[PDB]
């Protein structure tokens, strides 16, 4: 609405978008790492052993 607050809102939006992008990239990297580590072998056995040991 005003030029003084316009730049402040722009900077705030840019900072929020940067934080969101960083968080999303970190989450995607962690998910890819977990998938690469679990796809080696024993995809369902790791949970089946626990479901059999503990209460289903």
């Amino acid at each position: 609405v005003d030029v003084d607050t316009y730049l402040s809102n722009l900077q705030t939006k840019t900072t929020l978008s940067m934080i969101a992008d960083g968080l999303e990239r970190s989450a995607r990297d962690f998910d890819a790492f977990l998938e690469e580590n679990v796809t080696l072998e024993w995809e369902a056995q790791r949970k089946r052993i626990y479901q059999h040991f503990g209460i289903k």
Binding site: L34, W42, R46, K47, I49, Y50, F53
Partner: peptide, 14 residues
């Protein structure tokens, strides 16, 4: 839930 499960199989608590 999946976070701790990875530690169990990796640590060998079974």
């Amino acid at each position: 839930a999946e976070a701790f499960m990875l530690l169990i199989t990796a640590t060998g608590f079974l």
